[PDB]
């Protein structure tokens, strides 16, 4: 179903997905490499101990969009809403309010 | 202005490569899907013109239904690189849950 | 080129000087019992300047003796500050106070009982 | 006191973009080991992507060294690619000039690189195949246009030395590695096999006489081979989707020795596994080959390395650790790191395993 | 700390929480009013002198509510007037709570007829809303912005007319007297009033607001407000010290303040308090019972310029924090706007302008620019004043920036321009660049910052501690922190405001020192004035004083104390707080139960890096400025005797 | 005046432990990119044809 998952290319090892897991769960886990400041640290789902209770990725904490859930069917979610994509220009009026 | 259109993390909107199947034998079943989530689409040559671009950038989950390794064309001189063809690029994510407790 | 960056930075300190003369002209102050205008808001220019300046010089330089810091430095970190140590002493005996500050008449005041004979003169 | 002052820097792109600016100085002040001196040269090396459709990248390469008081030119301009994965086929042109000489040549030579063992028992086992012995077959079909009469002397003197000569196969071999090269060749493990002479050929042009070789060598690879072992890493033309140049070139003299390198280029990136990069591994051949002049004379080291990894990535390893962190530069210098620089200056071929990841 | 967020309440929740305050603010009114009542109605002796409403008392003698006239009689009527306007002030403040609990419970029903109006239709006071308004705001702030005119107006209106008949000052034009008070409140009534019309009329548009921006709107009117203090505090210093207010604020120096805390009469240890009590002991001075607050005149304590101070500060104190809150509680709205994406949809300057990431990182690089030129030039400045006036290096203060005066063109806002107003300035401008770092990355780096959406990374929580050790270390990046980061920055261009006002010389840190030519600068700089010691002799000097009061010294100690505790928090300590707790935890239940059978299961909490940062930042604020109260309410000790050369 | 420089200066060193110790390594580290991209975008601008150096950061280390 949701089987959210981390992505430990990007992860940083905040841990604000962490908090979140029951405590019980705590499916979600560190993982060390070395030298914590370069980033060893890391976040790891345990797919056995996650109950998809959505607490780790419908709180929006995941700073680095590590933290992906993939539906039943199947598409990864980076976030629980992202942004709409848009063309953007800066309005620059001309005569009146900031002209050019 | 940009930063603030899409996720503000992946300055080019990233599109994972979530389902391919190889029962239909033509791997037109790779399907891309932006990490929004709402569009189910396909591999075609506009997608190819925006992933050289850099518009785009597809990635590969490693915790899945394997999508196609050699069947989708693979370089494998190195660790697996795997690409739609030798000029496109498909930078896997790796993903260590089942390695680690 | 680094002679842009070097040009930039006597320039906006020859300005820096230049405004400040500028301004002490500008500013209406009775310069001194004795000092001129001309001199003393160019003798603070100075004192502002060469505390930046060597605040920046110092910083920098710390900063690549922490980058440049190895073992082989191992007489070459010791013995320079024992030099620079043995030239700060020296420069206090010849240059900064020269002398151990006898009275005019050369007395040596050095105990505490002529010390008060002496500052109840007569 | 014979120092060695070198700076190099390594500026990488993200994502799976192999490519690097690779700049590089360095000041010796030993002797080189160049019977004539003053040696300068300067080197060009710039490759487009030609017909990608059919993998065809076009590099250039323009050596101009001055040697004693001779000027000497070599061009070279071939399309490239890789007809199979272990054949590759080059089609190009160029020429070369020495003095009050020079003559032109086109190729159409193929080169077919093959390993002996495929194992899957070793890929699967040793994550870092540094060995691969291998051999290199090349057929090359040169054609020279004799304007000049020194050409067509040589082309005399050659047509009757292969008719004539029963042993012209393998003295030809110390014939061109000129000087300390074929002591060079046999210390970095390659060895070649006596060539095969399949025709030489007055096949006249529409402007003169035009000589015509083909002839078929094969050298082999112990695994110290780079030129074998790392086959398909010497050639991103899949990588290559912009022109790739490196401009290098030293100056040197019986004061010392000058080196510049400026290069953007792909294949600096390779992906040890699991979404780690690594920088790639050092090949061997300049390291031993080096080691025939670096063993010379007693130096000290002064060596600054200054790696700029792309936005958002950090080093997970480092074999010689890393001096300082600029947050996205990793600097090595002195320590651990002056030791290996003095250890492949003088022909060594340790690790220096740089592991990074985003 | 979030239960009443602005999200949490409507607009009638927040009409009634506002009046409910307004009549809780009322009753403290009175409360203040009541104590200064030095004598009582009934003759006998009054509360003393408070602050609270020391404050106020310039203001109510200017109204006739309280006199500066010290015999007993008149002062009688004096408290009984105080004693009026303060039951009037609770009364009211009665009537406001009542209405602010029906407008917070939505329950407004006549309690006589029942009908219940609606908060989105209603006739404003009965038929003047159909003769002005025509029908309510149907919706919409932009509408309610000419009837909050129109009831500003009616305020104005109102005090023209309390001050007219009830304090009987009646409008004259003249600005010299509280008349001008009366005459310019009927005139803003007539502006606030046509203006109203005006937008009611034609309203204003900022479309950032009017659609989900309690939040938003209340950020922008607390910035507003905010400025509108710092402006306040100005004016209040200006004006207080000009002539029209010295009948006031001056005449507060000829009189003498027992104020709770002072000097108290002191007796001997052999000391007994019956009848006469003389026998037993002697008290420290006779003609005053034992235990008694000393007098305390306030020629010498300057209680002009201290009352002065106080009201300025606190109004600038106010202002410059309800600026970094308003820009705080922006920032969680453009955060909020840019998680859900409205951001890009926005379509007015206030957030279109500045969309693109490269007209931030200009707009911080410039404030950056500035404040690291300002920042060094008062500084150097300072430093070298100091390095002269006490002759380091072989300096002296002939080479000190003594000739550095503001221009002739800007000595009109100094009384004695000299190189202390200069730096006042420059310091001024250096530290509002400083705190605008914070701001401006408040501002613009609420959701992302260039080098994170070039690390990969987003900021969402708004209050999120960090993100780890990654890249090195991310602490304190939320917009929660850079505004910690904020008023940490600003506490010291507030400190240079205290120092100012209560007449210290900023220009150096060691002027008065008796040392070398510190007290030359009266001599060279060719002062009137004698500024209160420099920077650094500034705390000795006011500590002679805290350190006389009881009162001042328990303040210090505390202010200090809870200063200090701010490290606790504040450092890089969390965990080692958490591992400390986890051991003491575990020592009191093993203790405990070998001690007593009774188990624990209790934890010690542990306050998270959030939570610790807030808690650090009140604490350091806190301390820092219940001791600039201590320097501002020691007394101004600036004389217009000038030291002479020390030779 | 030699125990007054010592006075300013130690509490001037002591202060400075400020901007380390408190939590704001993220903060100092998110300055300084904007430091490094202000003296990049001044150094070309008004300063012709210079761009380059970043602004280090200690770590919380
Ligand atoms: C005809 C020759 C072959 C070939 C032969 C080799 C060999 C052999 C080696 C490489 C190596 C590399 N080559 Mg190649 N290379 C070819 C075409 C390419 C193309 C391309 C798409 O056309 C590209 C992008 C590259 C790029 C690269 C990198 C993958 C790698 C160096 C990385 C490093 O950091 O360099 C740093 C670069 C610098 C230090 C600059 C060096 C500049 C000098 C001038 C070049 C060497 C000159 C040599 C000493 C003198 C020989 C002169 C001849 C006698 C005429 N080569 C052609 C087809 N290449 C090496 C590698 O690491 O393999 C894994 C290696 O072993
Ligand atoms: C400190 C620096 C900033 C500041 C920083 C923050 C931060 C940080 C936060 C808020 C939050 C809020 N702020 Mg604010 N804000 C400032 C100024 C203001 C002003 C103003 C005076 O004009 C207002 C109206 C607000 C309004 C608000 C709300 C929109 C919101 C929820 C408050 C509430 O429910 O808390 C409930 C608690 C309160 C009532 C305040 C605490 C005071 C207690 C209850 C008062 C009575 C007891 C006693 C007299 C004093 C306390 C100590 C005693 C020892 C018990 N801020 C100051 C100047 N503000 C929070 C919110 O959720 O943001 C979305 C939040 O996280
Ligand atoms: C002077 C004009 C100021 C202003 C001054 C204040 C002050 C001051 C306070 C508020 C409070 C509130 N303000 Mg306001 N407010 C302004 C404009 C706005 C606007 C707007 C423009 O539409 C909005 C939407 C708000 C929004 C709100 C709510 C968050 C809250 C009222 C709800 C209520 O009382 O909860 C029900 C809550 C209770 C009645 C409990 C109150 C408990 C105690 C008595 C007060 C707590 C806070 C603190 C001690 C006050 C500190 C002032 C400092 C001395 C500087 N403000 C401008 C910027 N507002 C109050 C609040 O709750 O702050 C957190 C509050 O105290
Ligand atoms: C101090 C009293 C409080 C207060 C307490 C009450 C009480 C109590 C009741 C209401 C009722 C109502 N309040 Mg009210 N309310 C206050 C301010 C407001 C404001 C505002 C202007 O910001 C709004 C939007 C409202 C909204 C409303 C209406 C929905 C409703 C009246 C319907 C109508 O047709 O009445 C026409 C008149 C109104 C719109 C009232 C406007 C507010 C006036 C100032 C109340 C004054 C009461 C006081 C005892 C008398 C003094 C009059 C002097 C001339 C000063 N109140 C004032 C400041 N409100 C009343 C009700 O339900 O009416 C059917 C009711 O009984
Ligand atoms: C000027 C009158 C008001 C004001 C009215 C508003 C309004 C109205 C809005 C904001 C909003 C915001 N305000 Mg404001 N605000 C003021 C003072 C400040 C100060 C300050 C310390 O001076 C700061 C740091 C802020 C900070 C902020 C942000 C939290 C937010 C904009 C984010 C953004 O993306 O901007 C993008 C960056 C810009 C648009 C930069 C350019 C600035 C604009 C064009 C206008 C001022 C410059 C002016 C032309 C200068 C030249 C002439 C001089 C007037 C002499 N305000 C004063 C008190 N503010 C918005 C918000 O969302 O509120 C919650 C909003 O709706
Ligand atoms: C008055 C000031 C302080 C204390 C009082 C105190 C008390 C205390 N501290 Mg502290 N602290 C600082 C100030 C004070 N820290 C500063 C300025 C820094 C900046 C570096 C700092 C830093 C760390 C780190 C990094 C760690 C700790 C701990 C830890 C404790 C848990 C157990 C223990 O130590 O008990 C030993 C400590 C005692 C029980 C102290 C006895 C009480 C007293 C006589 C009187 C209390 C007065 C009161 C505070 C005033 C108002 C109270 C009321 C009227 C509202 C613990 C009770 C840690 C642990 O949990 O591990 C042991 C840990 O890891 N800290
Ligand atoms: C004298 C003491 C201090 C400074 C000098 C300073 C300088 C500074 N700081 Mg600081 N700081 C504290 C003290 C000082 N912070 C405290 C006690 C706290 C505890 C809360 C604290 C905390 C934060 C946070 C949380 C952040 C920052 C920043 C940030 C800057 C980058 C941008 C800026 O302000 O440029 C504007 C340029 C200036 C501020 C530099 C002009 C220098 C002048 C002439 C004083 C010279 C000091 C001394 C004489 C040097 C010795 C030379 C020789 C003797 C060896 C930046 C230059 C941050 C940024 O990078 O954000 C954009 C950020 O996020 N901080
Ligand atoms: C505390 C002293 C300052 C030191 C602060 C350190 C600065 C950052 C240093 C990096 C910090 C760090 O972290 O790393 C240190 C790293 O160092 C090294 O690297 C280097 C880049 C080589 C260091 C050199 C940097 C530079 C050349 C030196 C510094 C820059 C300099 C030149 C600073 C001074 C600039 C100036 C003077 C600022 C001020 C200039 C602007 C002013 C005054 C405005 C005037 C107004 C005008 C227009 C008129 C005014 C007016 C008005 C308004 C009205 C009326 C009237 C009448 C008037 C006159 C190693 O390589 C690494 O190993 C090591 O790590
Ligand atoms: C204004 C701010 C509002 C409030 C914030 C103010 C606030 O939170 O304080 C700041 C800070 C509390 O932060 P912590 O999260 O570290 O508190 C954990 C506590 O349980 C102490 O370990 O206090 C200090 O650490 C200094 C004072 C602690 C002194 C209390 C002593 C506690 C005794 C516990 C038993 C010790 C015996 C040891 C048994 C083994
Ligand atoms: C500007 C020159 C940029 C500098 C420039 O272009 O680069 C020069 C220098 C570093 O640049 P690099 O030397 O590394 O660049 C190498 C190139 O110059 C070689 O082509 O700038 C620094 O980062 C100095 C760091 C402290 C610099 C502090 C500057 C603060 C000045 C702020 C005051 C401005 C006054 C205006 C306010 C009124
Ligand atoms: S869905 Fe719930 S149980 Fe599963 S990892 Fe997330 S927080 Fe833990
Ligand atoms: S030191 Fe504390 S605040 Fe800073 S990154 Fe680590 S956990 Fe976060
Ligand atoms: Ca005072």
């Known amino acids: 179903k949701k089987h959210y998952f981390i992505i430990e290319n990007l992860c940083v090892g905040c841990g604000l997905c962490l908090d979140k897991c029951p405590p019980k769960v705590n499916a979600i886990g560190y993982k060390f490499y070395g030298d914590v400041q370069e980033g060893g640290f890391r976040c790891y789902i345990d797919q056995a101990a996650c109950i998809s209770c959505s607490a780790c990725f419908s709180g929006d904490e995941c700073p680095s969009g590590a933290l992906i859930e993939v539906l039943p069917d199947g598409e990864v979610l980076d976030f629980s809403y992202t942004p709409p994509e848009r063309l953007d220009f800066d309005l620059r009026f001309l005569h009146r309010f900031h002209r050019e | ?101 | 080129s680094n002679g842009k960056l070097i040009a930039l930075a006597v320039g906006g300190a020859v300005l820096m000087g230049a405004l400040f003369f500028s301004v002490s002209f500008l500013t209406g102050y009775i310069p001194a019992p004795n000092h001129s205008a001309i001199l003393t808001p160019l003798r603070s220019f100075m004192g502002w300047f060469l505390l930046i300046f060597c605040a920046s010089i110092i910083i920098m330089g710390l900063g690549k003796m922490s980058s440049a810091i190895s073992d082989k430095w191992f007489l070459s970190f010791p013995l320079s500050i024992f030099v620079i140590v043995m030239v700060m002493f020296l420069s206090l005996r010849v240059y900064w106070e020269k002398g151990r500050t006898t009275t005019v008449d050369g007395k040596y005041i050095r105990t505490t009982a002529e010390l008060k004979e002496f500052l109840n003169k007569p | 006191v014979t120092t060695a002052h070198s700076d190099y820097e390594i500026v990488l792109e993200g994502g799976s973009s192999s490519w690097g600016k690779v700049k590089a100085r360095a000041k010796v002040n030993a002797p080189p080991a160049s019977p004539l001196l003053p040696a300068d040269c300067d080197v060009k090396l710039n490759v487009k992507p030609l017909d990608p459709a059919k993998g065809f990248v076009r590099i250039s390469a323009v050596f101009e060294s001055i040697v004693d008081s001779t000027k000497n030119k070599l061009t070279i301009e071939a399309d490239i690619a890789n007809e199979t994965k272990e054949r590759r086929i080059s089609v190009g042109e160029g020429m070369v000039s020495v003095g009050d000489f020079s003559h032109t040549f086109s190729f159409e030579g193929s080169v077919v690189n093959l390993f002996y063992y495929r194992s899957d028992a070793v890929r699967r086992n040793v994550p870092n195949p540094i060995y691969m012995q291998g051999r290199q077959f090349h057929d090359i079909l040169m054609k020279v246009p004799l304007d000049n009469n020194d050409l067509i002397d040589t082309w005399e003197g050659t047509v009757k030395a292969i008719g004539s000569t029963g042993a012209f196969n393998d003295w030809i071999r110390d014939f061109w590695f000129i000087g300390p090269a074929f002591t060079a060749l046999n210390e970095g493990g390659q060895r070649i096999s006596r060539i095969e002479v399949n025709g030489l050929n007055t096949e006249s042009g529409p402007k003169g006489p035009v000589g015509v070789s083909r002839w078929r060598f094969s050298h082999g690879g112990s695994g110290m081979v780079d030129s074998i072992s790392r086959w398909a890493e010497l050639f991103p033309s899949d990588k290559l989707n912009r022109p790739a140049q490196v401009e290098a070139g030293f100056r040197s003299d019986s004061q010392g020795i000058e080196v510049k390198v400026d290069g953007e280029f792909p294949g600096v990136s390779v992906d040890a596994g699991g979404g780690l990069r690594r920088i790639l591994n050092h090949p061997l051949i300049p390291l031993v080959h080096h080691g025939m002049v670096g063993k010379f004379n007693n130096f000290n080291v002064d060596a600054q390395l200054k790696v700029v990894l792309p936005k958002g990535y950090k080093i997970r390893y480092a074999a010689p650790q890393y001096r300082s962190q600029n947050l996205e530069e990793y600097r090595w210098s002195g320590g651990a790191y002056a030791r290996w620089v003095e250890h492949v200056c003088k022909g060594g071929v340790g690790q220096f395993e740089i592991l990074y990841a985003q | 700390y979030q239960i009443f967020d602005t999200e949490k309440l409507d607009d009638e929740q927040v009409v009634g929480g506002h009046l409910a305050l307004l009549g809780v603010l009322g009753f403290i009114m009175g409360i203040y009013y009541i104590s200064g009542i030095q004598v009582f109605p009934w003759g006998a002796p009054g509360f003393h002198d408070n602050w609270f409403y020391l404050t106020i008392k310039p203001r109510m003698v200017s109204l006739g509510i309280d006199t500066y006239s010290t015999k007993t009689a008149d002062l009688e009527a004096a408290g009984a007037r105080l004693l009026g306007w303060a039951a009037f002030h609770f009364l009211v403040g009665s009537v406001l709570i009542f209405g602010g609990w029906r407008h917070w419970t939505h329950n407004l029903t006549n309690p006589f007829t029942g009908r219940c109006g609606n908060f989105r239709d209603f006739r404003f006071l009965g038929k003047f809303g159909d003769v002005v308004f025509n029908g309510t705001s149907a919706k919409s702030y932009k509408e309610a912005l000419g009837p909050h005119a129109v009831y500003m107006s009616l305020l104005f209106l109102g005090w023209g007319i309390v001050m007219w008949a009830i304090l009987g000052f009646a409008p004259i034009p003249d600005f010299q007297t509280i008349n001008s008070e009366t005459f310019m409140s009927f005139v803003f009534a007539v502006i606030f009033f046509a203006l109203g019309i005006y937008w009611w009329n034609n309203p204003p548009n900022a479309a950032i607001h009017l659609n989900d921006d309690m939040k938003a709107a209340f950020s922008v009117h607390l910035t507003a407000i905010g400025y509108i203090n710092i402006a306040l505090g100005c004016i209040a210093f200006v004006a207080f010290q000009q002539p029209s207010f010295a009948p006031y604020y001056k005449e507060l120096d000829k009189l003498v303040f027992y104020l709770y805390g002072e000097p108290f009469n002191r007796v001997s240890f052999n000391f007994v308090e019956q009848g006469g009590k003389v026998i037993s002991g002697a008290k420290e001075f006779a003609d005053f019972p034992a235990y008694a607050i000393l007098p305390k005149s306030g020629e010498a304590f300057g209680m002009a310029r201290v009352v002065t101070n106080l009201i300025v500060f606190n109004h600038i104190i106010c202002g410059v924090l309800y600026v970094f809150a308003g820009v705080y509680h922006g920032g969680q709205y453009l955060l909020k706007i840019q998680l859900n994406g409205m951001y890009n949809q926005i379509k007015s300057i206030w957030i279109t302008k500045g969309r693109d990431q490269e007209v931030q990182v200009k707009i911080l690089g410039t404030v950056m620019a500035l404040c690291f030129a300002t920042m060094l030039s008062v500084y150097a400045v300072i430093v070298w004043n100091t390095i002269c006036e006490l002759n380091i290096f072989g300096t002296n203060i002939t080479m000190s920036f003594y000739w550095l005066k503001p221009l002739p063109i800007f000595q009109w806002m100094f009384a004695d321009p000299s190189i202390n107003d200069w730096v006042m300035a420059h310091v001024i401008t250096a530290g509002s660049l400083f705190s605008l770092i914070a701001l401006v990355r408040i501002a613009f780096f609420a959701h992302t910052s260039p080098l994170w959406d070039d690390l990969g990374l987003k900021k969402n929580s708004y209050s999120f501690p960090c993100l780890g050790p990654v890249y090195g270390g991310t602490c304190g990046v939320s917009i929660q922190d850079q505004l910690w980061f904020a008023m940490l920055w600003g506490i010291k261009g507030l400190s240079a405001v205290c120092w100012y006002i209560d007449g210290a010389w900023i220009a150096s840190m060691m002027y008065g020192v008796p040392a070398a030519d510190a007290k030359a600068w009266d001599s060279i700089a060719h002062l009137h004035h004698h500024y209160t010691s420099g920077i650094f002799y500034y705390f000795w000097t006011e500590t002679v004083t805290i350190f006389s009061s009881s009162h001042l010294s328990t303040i210090l100690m505390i202010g200090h104390l809870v200063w200090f505790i701010s490290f606790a928090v504040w450092f890089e300590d969390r965990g080692s707080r958490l591992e400390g707790a986890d051991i003491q935890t575990r020592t009191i239940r093993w203790l405990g139960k070998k001690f007593l059978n009774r188990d624990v299961n209790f934890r010690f909490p542990v306050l998270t890096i959030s939570d610790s940062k807030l808690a650090g930042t009140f604490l350091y604020f806190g301390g820092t400025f219940m001791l600039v109260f201590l320097f501002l309410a020691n007394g101004f000790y600036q004389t217009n005797s000038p030291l002479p050369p020390p030779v």
């Open chain 2, 1 to 101: 202005s940009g930063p603030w259109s899409g996720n503000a993390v992946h300055k080019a909107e990233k599109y994972f490569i979530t389902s391919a199947k190889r029962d239909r034998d033509g791997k037109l079943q790779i399907e891309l899907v932006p990490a929004s989530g709402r569009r189910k689409l396909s591999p075609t040559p506009e997608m190819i013109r925006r992933l050289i671009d850099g518009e785009i950038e597809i990635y590969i989950l490693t915790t899945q239904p394997d999508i196609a390794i050699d069947m989708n064309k693979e370089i494998i001189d190195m660790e697996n690189r795997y690409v739609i063809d030798f000029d496109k690029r498909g930078v896997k994510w790796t993903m260590r849950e089942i390695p680690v407790f």
